[PDB]
Write an enzyme that holds these catalytic residues in place. Structure first.
Site, PDB file in Angstrom:
ATOM      1  N   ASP A 184     -26.704  -6.275  20.056  1.00  0.00           N
ATOM      2  CA  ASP A 184     -25.597  -6.975  19.445  1.00  0.00           C
ATOM      3  C   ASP A 184     -25.523  -8.422  19.899  1.00  0.00           C
ATOM      4  O   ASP A 184     -26.384  -9.206  19.496  1.00  0.00           O
ATOM      5  CB  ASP A 184     -24.318  -6.174  19.633  1.00  0.00           C
ATOM      6  CG  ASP A 184     -24.369  -4.813  18.907  1.00  0.00           C
ATOM      7  OD1 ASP A 184     -25.370  -4.552  18.196  1.00  0.00           O
ATOM      8  OD2 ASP A 184     -23.413  -4.007  19.025  1.00  0.00           O
TER       9      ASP A 184
HETATM   10  C1  LIG Z   1     -29.693  -2.295  19.916  1.00  0.00           C
HETATM   11  C2  LIG Z   1     -28.854  -2.929  18.854  1.00  0.00           C
HETATM   12  O1  LIG Z   1     -28.658  -4.136  18.785  1.00  0.00           O
HETATM   13  N1  LIG Z   1     -28.349  -2.085  17.959  1.00  0.00           N
HETATM   14  C3  LIG Z   1     -27.656  -2.559  16.766  1.00  0.00           C
HETATM   15  C4  LIG Z   1     -26.443  -1.738  16.364  1.00  0.00           C
HETATM   16  O2  LIG Z   1     -25.448  -1.851  17.394  1.00  0.00           O
HETATM   17  C5  LIG Z   1     -25.912  -2.304  15.047  1.00  0.00           C
HETATM   18  O3  LIG Z   1     -24.835  -1.495  14.572  1.00  0.00           O
HETATM   19  C6  LIG Z   1     -27.025  -2.361  13.979  1.00  0.00           C
HETATM   20  C7  LIG Z   1     -26.598  -2.932  12.630  1.00  0.00           C
HETATM   21  O4  LIG Z   1     -27.534  -2.562  11.599  1.00  0.00           O
HETATM   22  O5  LIG Z   1     -28.074  -3.181  14.464  1.00  0.00           O
HETATM   23  C8  LIG Z   1     -28.692  -2.672  15.651  1.00  0.00           C
HETATM   24  O6  LIG Z   1     -29.343  -1.417  15.439  1.00  0.00           O
END
Ligand SMILES: CC(=O)N[C@@H]1[C@@H](O)[C@H](O)[C@@H](CO)O[C@@H]1O
Ligand SMILES: CC(=O)N[C@@H]1[C@@H](O)[C@H](O)[C@@H](CO)O[C@@H]1O
EC number: 2.4.1.211
Lengths: 746, 734
Positions: B298
């Site tokens: 995130d």
């Molecule tokens: C590890 C990471 O950043 N996970 C994020 C998740 O939190 C988010 O909801 C998603 C949106 O498509 O993107 C990523 O998978």
């Protein structure tokens, strides 16, 4: 039914010759006495640059020459040695030691591109090896050198192909040198006096052989049917420099190892050489034909072998006063290369099979290939008529095959009856189509070819376009980008077709970054034009990060190049029932499995709207990876396996179409024909003069009150023909059949 | 049988929370055990940001291409963007911050020739050329936090208030964020770990007018700008970034792009600012007796946990999402923090926890993909997330988790948390090097696709393989040569990407260095279009074609016959590939093509098959006949090996992950490096099992990477062998 047919003959075979000539309606016989009394036109081969070992062995420095590129040799220290010949056929090719190697050769660091200094390399006196010093470790180096061609390439091909083993290797020669040239014109003057019975001199061919080099394992190494590699000499090069005011480098011929394949985007140096060499060649061909005409004889040119520098589709070809051109009928496309030539009195097809033990042997059935060959030619001939057909080789061989002999009887009568009914006038074409590439008219029907009539994995998805068109009920012209930049798009063209891989003569390279070109095309399409792009049409690498096909906006499709992976691509639903696909055999199993597996739901970094399972049903040949729709107003007709194979897009008054590839098939030619009518907003004009069945085609002849319909297969075909007035007629066509019918006169 | 486990809580599930915490050996609880609390520094305070709306984060956006049909044209700004997420910035002078481009020519339209509409989000352009395409690059406020937005749209939270994010680069909002955190610390005295989820800038995540993802880059820095930072950037670097330096022609600086100076410059500048502010949060946590833990995801932009100097931040831990072996290694291999934690799948949410579903399937499957990677690079802690009561409904799942947390610890206790022995030193070479460790070939986190999976598979295979992997850059190699402990260099990807390298392969110094190294015994493995450089040499596209014995025809060399030597179906490399006796026979019988004019020869008329190579590289071919072709089906090359002095080059066109394909690559590795006899040691006859050896503890184990009984025979170093019969994702030690 008699005439328009050329029959081969041989020693001690006059009865059968007489019989066959009667049977096939032959009005001419080709050379290889009681036969000379038969009253026919007599053809006699002439091989101007060979068949005189007695002379050239006394002037070996006037053989033709070629620039050759050695293998790349890795330097593992500050010196390197380069064998010149380890990779070539020594029976065919010999390094030229007579002409100063420091003046005419180039050592190159292929790793940097730099020409190694002349002072840094010496030619060994006792070995065909170059010594280089003062160079960089871990770079690759090559020599570009002049080699004499000590064995005529085609006779070499025939020698190896037939295993003549022992027989003497025929040495070729180069009339650029004036002693040899005089030799050739004296010899020709002499031969004409010694040949009053000859009526047609059948030049097979003239002065320069198309690129055809063999390797140390006796295989083809390099070929290009249009190649100018085998046209050099120190004096030609030096005369070129004086005339054009700049020196060509050997690199201008070896071309990084590409040897100027016609697929390469054309360089100015290439074209200059063609201009130079072709003028020399053309002047001398005209001499041969003037001399011919003064001996009461006709001159005929074989479209093949030593044909380089003739350039029959360039202007002035007519000033040669050649009587005729004869060529190998390999298919529709190669039939059209002949038929379409202007500036001759007449044209002639040498049909297949060649009368030779390879196809004429016990248990094989030559008539299948005979008819198939005729069928592929016939579809083309209705669009552009040739004047004469004929065969080649040992007549005695074909005589032993009753079924074949009857097959030919059939073809000959048909050929004549097409000509008599039509008056030798081309079928009406329903649409004006222009193939657009770097070469334009000078390579009419020659696009996508490498070796003659031998498409391969790499070319056949584009070759299929010409083959489809060669017999299609449309007018086909070839135009260049210089044509378009200079004059715009003529107002009569209905469709413009641009196909091929990126960075080729056939897509055009960096000319697509020229805004003037992109403007002209966009305006024309917007105003009512139609642009069909195949493969990687309008492509230009690196120019725009987010745009590979410059006219992606017109055809509605672009190719992902791993620069734009963060941008989700949203594929609109495929439209499986369309004008364009109307004739594609439907496959219930495939269609409902494609209906049932649905489209992919949107998902991060993956976009969405892509069919999970393939619809298929169309052979599009070699894939273009990761093509996608530029937005959701594009109509997708096929988008299987996560990318686009066929799409149409509205663009103001006009349309563009994308197609990833188009191998030739009756079905794909129907597809292409539909694209042409659909993109040009001419859905209305489609039904007039068409066969409902795609295995057959229709030819209208408004001035002769006629139309015929032909069966392109060796199976029975029923079809429904639609006339202009809306009326229709059914037909049941036999194996390879044809049928004529009236329609009002004009 | 005690600890290293993080459990998620709930509101009233107090009774069953004690019982699960005791069955699973939980030593921490997330929202007398160790307590975690999520912290969302740039959101959850709409009351503040509603009155400071010019301090929301910003991003440059590229409009659609608009065709001009005369000397003027109008460009709508928001037709292609989700208006609930993004709003054009009208405050900061557009003629100063925005750019109108003639895409057809590349030229920046003079700002004198366009205006912004006072009442519509539309730019009027004059003096243009007809039949050119035009775009605007404009600054926009992100008024809706992208992840929260995503979670809202996914779960249909309907008209629940949208979280508005904020950008601490603005000083009033910074104070607010720091003050608030001070206060919050004083109010959470029973919180031991602050689980920052995450920090100050979100990875590029833009949505379209139809509520769909429009642009995503997990490493992306699009969402990090402002007039203020842009002006400051100019004043520290002495040049002005263009809007183009962010929208990048439509590419938005995708990691697949070969890095540009302006790109890395921005990463330095922004990264400076994030790291100091992240250190402050870490000090304040430490001053109040609490640990700081970073969520690798995130809002992580600017942290660069693989760049030098991450340790100077003082983070106690990174936690991250376990999607697969590669994503596990992303977290595992991070230096600069005390411990690491994986959040495992499934998330405790009803989308997996159904009326009649068996979520223990997903559970073991996630643990298998992780543990094979963990053996090579250990993570400290394990855990889950979501709603414990949903998870508590499924006794078979609960008994699975219990089993996993035990295993997870038993590995720790048995191995001192030490990385297993690696038998070879493998380096992946690309433009990014270390800073994108385990992050090559990724677009959206844990979601390989058509375009990437043939290369992602290389990382997924490596992630759990018995070898030592490092990630090096062209700059590294150009400045320091090749470290002498490296056995194998891999280079893989499409042409003109960061992963192959782009024009750096026309730098003779690079070619030289690699060449010499291979010549003296090194090993180069090239996947896809290795060392590719377009148009540099007409007859040579893979600049190192000489090393691996393969090049790709680019339609310039069609006049040159290609002669494919016969394929070698019985080779070390392909040993574990089954072939259907019948398929083989069909290939043996169909034979090779006879030389034909303008068609070369030697290509098998039928395919041998048996190996999924993923996406084809069209028209690969053997540069000479001394190359050993292992598979060359359909008229081109998929797998080849070539001796090059004392060393070897090897070509693989693509390699989707699977157990076979990791086995195939691992054999590639041992073979290319002339380490064939070092292979058998600590090895599993079965490709579906793997073997970690731990000399120091006098121990080895063997795992089942599948949900199936597997029989494998393991060869130890002395030449002895034990036979195992492992059950579904089982494991045994010795
Ligand atoms: C590890 C990471 O950043 N996970 C994020 C998740 O939190 C988010 O909801 C998603 C949106 O498509 O993107 C990523 O998978
Ligand atoms: C039309 C033409 O020039 N055909 C030639 C043929 O004569 C030659 O024998 C062959 C050798 O490969 O190449 C081409 O097919």
């Amino acid at each position: 039914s008699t005439g328009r047919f050329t029959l081969p003959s041989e020693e001690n075979f006059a009865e059968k010759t007489k019989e066959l000539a009667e049977l096939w309606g032959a009005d001419a016989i080709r050379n290889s006495e009681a036969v000379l009394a038969l009253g026919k036109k007599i053809y006699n081969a002439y091989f101007p640059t060979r068949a005189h070992n007695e002379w050239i062995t006394l002037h070996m420095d006037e053989t033709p020459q070629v620039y050759l590129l050695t293998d790349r040799i890795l330097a593992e220290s500050d010196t390197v040695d380069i064998p010149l010949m380890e990779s070539f056929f020594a029976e065919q090719l010999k390094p030229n030691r007579d002409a100063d190697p420091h003046k005419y050769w180039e050592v190159v660091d292929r790793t940097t591109g730099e020409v190694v200094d002349s002072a840094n390399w010496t030619l060994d006196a006792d070995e065909d090896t170059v010594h280089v010093s003062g160079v960089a470790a871990w770079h690759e180096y090559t020599v570009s050198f002049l080699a004499y061609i000590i064995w005529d390439p085609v006779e070499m091909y025939n020698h190896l192909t037939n295993d003549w083993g022992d027989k003497e290797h025929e040495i070729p020669f180069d009339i650029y040198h004036p002693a040899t040239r005089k030799f050739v014109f004296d010899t020709f003057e002499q031969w004409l006096k010694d040949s009053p019975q000859t009526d047609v001199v059948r030049f097979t061919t003239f002065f320069y052989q198309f690129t055809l080099l063999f390797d140390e394992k006796r295989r083809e190494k390099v070929v290009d049917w249009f190649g100018y590699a085998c046209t050099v000499s120190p004096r030609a090069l030096d005369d070129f420099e004086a005339k054009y005011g700049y020196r060509l480098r050997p690199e201008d011929f070896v071309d990084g190892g590409a040897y100027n394949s016609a697929w390469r985007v054309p360089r100015k140096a290439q074209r200059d050489w063609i201009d130079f060499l072709s003028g020399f060649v053309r002047e001398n061909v005209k001499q041969l034909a003037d001399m011919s005409h003064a001996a009461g004889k006709e001159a005929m040119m074989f479209l093949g072998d030593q044909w380089i520098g003739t350039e029959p589709y360039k202007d002035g070809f007519d000033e040669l006063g050649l009587d005729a051109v004869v060529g190998s009928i390999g298919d529709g496309t190669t039939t059209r290369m002949i038929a379409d030539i202007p500036g001759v009195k007449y044209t002639e097809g040498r049909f297949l099979p060649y009368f030779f033990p390879d196809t004429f042997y016990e248990g094989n059935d030559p008539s299948i290939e005979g008819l198939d060959n005729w069928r592929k030619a016939r579809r083309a001939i209705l669009r552009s008529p040739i004047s004469r057909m004929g065969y080649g080789g040992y007549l005695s061989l074909a005589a032993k095959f009753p079924k074949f002999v009857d097959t030919v009887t059939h073809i000959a009568n048909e050929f004549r009856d097409i000509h008599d009914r039509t008056g030798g006038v081309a079928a009406e074409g329903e649409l004006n189509v222009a193939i657009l590439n770097s070469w334009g008219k000078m390579r009419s029907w020659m696009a996508f070819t490498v070796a003659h009539a031998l498409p391969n994995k790499q070319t056949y998805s584009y070759y299929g376009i010409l083959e489809s068109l060669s017999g299609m009920r449309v007018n086909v012209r070839f135009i260049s980008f210089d044509d378009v930049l200079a004059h715009g798009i003529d107002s009569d063209i209905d469709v413009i077709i641009n196909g091929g891989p990126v960075d080729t003569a056939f897509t055009g390279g960096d000319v697509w970054t020229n805004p003037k070109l992109v403007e002209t095309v966009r305006a024309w399409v917007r105003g009512g034009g139609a642009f069909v792009g195949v493969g990687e049409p309008s492509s230009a690498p690196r120019f725009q990060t987010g745009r590979f096909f410059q006219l992606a906006d017109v055809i509605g499709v672009d190719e992902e190049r791993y620069q734009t992976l963060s941008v989700d691509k949203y594929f609109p639903p495929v439209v499986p029932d369309h004008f364009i696909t109307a004739d594609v055999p439907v496959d219930p199993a495939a269609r409902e499995a494609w209906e049932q597996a649905g489209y992919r739901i949107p998902l991060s970094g993956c976009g969405g709207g892509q069919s999970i399972k393939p619809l298929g049903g169309i052979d599009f040949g070699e894939p273009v990876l990761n093509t996608y729709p530029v937005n959701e107003n594009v109509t997708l007709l096929r988008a299987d396996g996560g990318q686009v194979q066929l799409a149409t897009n509205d663009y103001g008054k006009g349309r563009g179409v994308y197609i990833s590839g188009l191998p030739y098939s009756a079905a794909n030619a129907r597809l292409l024909e539909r694209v042409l009518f659909y993109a040009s907003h001419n859905e209305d004009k489609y039904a007039a003069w068409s066969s409902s069945n795609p295995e057959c085609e229709v030819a209208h002849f408004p001035e002769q009150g006629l139309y015929c319909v032909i069966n392109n297969t060796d199976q029975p075909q029923k079809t429904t023909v639609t006339l202009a007035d809306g009326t229709t007629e059914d037909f049941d066509l036999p194996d390879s059949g044809i049928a004529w019918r009236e329609a009002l006169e004009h």
